């Protein structure tokens, strides 16, 4: 598997309406990805207009869309499953994620930041979790829009919501090896 400083990234669309979790994860599960990418900056948008229309999806993924395996056709709906590894070391963190429209984030298995709805543009500050151990730790994510205004920045926090940072390739890896790239 590729080794990059980055998660694995894959585009799904539909001409289906997206209303939730359960729908976008039905989506991943029903056919292979409209395009790959390598998210190594997970800070996109915002943008208008729909991000499944036109190049708005380039536009959203920015520094992350010259990795695109394709151009994705139009869809109305359409959204993003990121997947690997992400170091930190063992402590307490927290998620403040601005979206629209929904999301989930999920670390060593485990949810950590859900919105479950479409939403304009919102920021939720989730609860605390913990690390147990120092290393690379298994992270995924999903996120989607229905429609219109579509952003997405997952910020983390290590000192109690003081200052949070983006996940980029300082500290994330396609597969838990260490990355030199
Ligand atoms: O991007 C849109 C836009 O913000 C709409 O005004 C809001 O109602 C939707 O849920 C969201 O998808
Ligand atoms: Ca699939
Ligand atoms: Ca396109
Ligand atoms: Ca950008
Ligand atoms: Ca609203
Ligand atoms: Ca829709
Ligand atoms: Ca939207």
Redesign the pocket.
Known sequence: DSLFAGLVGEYYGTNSQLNNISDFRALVDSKEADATFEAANI???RGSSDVAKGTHLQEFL??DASTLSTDPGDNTDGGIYLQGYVYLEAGTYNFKVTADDGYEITINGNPVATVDNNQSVYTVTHASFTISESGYQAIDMIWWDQGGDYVFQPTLSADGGSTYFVLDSAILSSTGETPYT
């Open positions: 800070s996109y948008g920015g520094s």
